[PDB]
Design a protein around this ligand. Structure first.
Ligand code: HEM
Ligand code: HEM
Ligand code: HEM
Ligand code: HEM
Lengths: 141, 146, 146, 141
């Protein structure tokens, strides 16, 4: 429950993401848009074509929020409270979509860091994502 | 399942490069490590206590091969997934009592495992096509449950 | 969908007693109150701020009556839900983009409302038959997403 | 999470349950056994026939733990820790089954407390049961 081993595992893998962060973020989004087309609906004002600069820009933001969250695993609710209001109150993002983006991020990580994406690291990331997801939809609980 | 002609082809090309002897033990083993309540159904498979214990477990790997064999079948019968998995469906419901939500998790772990193996070759549109295949299998496996 | 005649009979007999005016608005209103992200799709209905606002909204009551009219046609084609529902599926996927998980939520909500409206007469066997029906209508509605 | 309004809503419905708590816990397990037969596997040694004295007994133990949870609404994780150990570590209960039993418990409360089960009380009860579910599956993360 972001148990000691998980954090350390999470900090470690996000570490090798290091400076790729934003591009992984944007790739995770594009993967989500193409596999789960219902998701495109939240971004009417965006150009969601591959290459998209707006998606590249958005990806960077997504990636920065996760980096912070990792930097603050023991205090996520404080660290993500504003994004949680944004997502649940203003945008009303359906909770299922957080599982979709999480799945797409794991896919993007597996595709880019094969040597680091071990079963153990896959388990910890999955739990880190679930808990980031839990905080962001906490306004509906 | 409805794939475009571009998708059928892409799915085919990638499947041909899959290592039958390993990817299935890898998917099943990551399912047991990431979603631990699934170990309940394999309690007699030996030591499942650590990620290495599960992954290198000979009975896990052996059983993973058969599971990948069934996916291969469905890939060969995309237009009749349902008739193809009817018996497996009865077995999973009637005899094993697996909740069908786990068929979706397994399909998603399989996608991560293809991404892990194929890297950049596993592009967003190819992932999208495999997402349709996996959901189509989870669906067909769930048919004899109600 | 596979219902034995006894389940068919049980579901049809109860359904003939449903007051759609009462059941429909309660079902839709409850979905909007309990699972608040669903309000995003009904932004044109007006004020959906508090439970009292949702529950008193006339648009919500009216629409709930329509939704129930669609379940009625499905009850009349239990063996061909997918066909009965193809157009609504198109509507919900292509035009509205509703994720299918919410078809399961609304089905479960309708089940709570039927229990609420019929009390003890909504026995465990009749609930079991209705769960098969709502699972079937949900799957028929997700059809075009696949 | 439980907002004070929810807390209140929960104490009030649960107080109306009062003495029938055990009968309602048994009814909800019976509903779940018939509706979702996959859940039956966890109770190999029980007589699950309708009216089984075993189901009645077990229903009463479930109701008690929920009465305890309502009483310790602010400290659930503390109040239910041993139960989490049991369900997650020892029994390895698939998490999806807690959603199935939560629904069945809402359907039983709807059928027995029509005046109390208003839309806002229903919302509050769903959040509370999702919180109990969350505590009981916490060892999986
Ligand atoms: C891992 C979970 C997620 C994280 C960390 C995340 C993070 C963020 C951040 C940092 C922003 C920009 C905030 C600002 O500029 O003030 C944002 C906005 C946004 N998010 Fe997310 N988000 C997540 C999941 C989702 C999901 C699943 C969707 C929908 C499918 C979604 C839809 C949006 C939208 C529509 C915006 C507004 C974009 C714009 O118009 O600027 N987010 N998110
Ligand atoms: C795409 C999803 C799945 C496929 C294609 C699949 C396929 C298979 C196959 C081909 C067999 C062996 C059939 C035989 O030779 O009799 C089998 C057995 C089994 N499956 Fe699956 N399965 C899937 C998902 C799952 C899941 C998610 C679980 C539980 C977490 C599960 C649990 C089992 C068990 C317990 C057995 C029997 C093993 C034994 O006792 O020897 N299956 N499955
Ligand atoms: C699974 C059971 C469902 C049934 C049987 C159903 C049925 C219907 C029907 C009969 C209509 C009227 C369509 C027309 O006028 O041609 C409709 C419209 C609509 N449905 Fe559903 N629906 C279901 C679930 C949902 C869910 C879960 C949502 C969103 C969370 C949703 C969103 C809507 C919307 C936005 C419209 C159009 C309303 C308007 O703007 O007039 N539906 N549905
Ligand atoms: C509201 C959620 C739940 C609550 C409050 C709860 C509560 C309890 C309690 C108080 C006990 C007795 C513990 C003991 O005597 O050591 C128990 C045992 C048990 N529960 Fe649950 N439970 C819940 C959900 C479930 C679910 C979803 C399942 C599976 C579908 C399940 C299966 C079991 C089993 C198999 C046992 C052991 C039975 C025995 O052998 O005596 N529980 N539960």
């Amino acid at each position: 429950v972001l148990s000691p081993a998980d954090k350390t595992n999470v900090k470690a893998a996000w570490g090798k993401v290091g400076a790729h962060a934003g591009e992984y973020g944007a790739e995770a989004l594009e993967r989500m848009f193409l596999s789960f087309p219902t998701t495109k609906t939240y971004f009417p004002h965006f150009d969601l074509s591959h290459g998209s600069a707006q998606v590249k820009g958005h990806g960077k933001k997504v990636a920065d929020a996760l980096t912070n969250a990792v930097a603050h695993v023991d205090d996520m609710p404080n660290a993500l409270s504003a994004l949680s209001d944004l997502h649940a109150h203003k945008l009303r993002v359906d909770p299922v979509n957080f599982k979709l983006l999480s799945h797409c991020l794991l896919v993007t990580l597996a595709a880019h860091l094969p040597a680091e994406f071990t079963p153990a690291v896959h388990a910890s990331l999955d739990k880190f994502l679930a808990s980031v997801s839990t905080v962001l939809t906490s306004k509906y609980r | 399942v409805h794939l475009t002609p571009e998708e059928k082809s892409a799915v085919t090309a990638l499947w041909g490069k899959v290592n039958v002897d390993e990817v299935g033990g890898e998917a099943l083993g990551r399912l047991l490590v990431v979603y631990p309540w699934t170990q309940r159904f394999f309690e007699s498979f030996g030591d499942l206590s650590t990620p290495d214990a599960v992954m290198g477990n000979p009975k896990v790997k052996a059983h993973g091969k058969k599971v990948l064999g069934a996916f291969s079948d469905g890939l060969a019968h995309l237009d009749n997934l349902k008739g193809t998995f009817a018996t497996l469906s009865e077995l999973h419901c009637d005899k094993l009592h697996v909740d069908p939500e786990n068929f979706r998790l397994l399909g998603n772990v399989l996608v991560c495992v293809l991404a892990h193996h194929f890297g950049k070759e596993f592009t967003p549109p190819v992932q999208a096509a495999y997402q349709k295949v996996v959901a189509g299998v989870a669906n067909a496996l769930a048919h004899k449950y109600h």
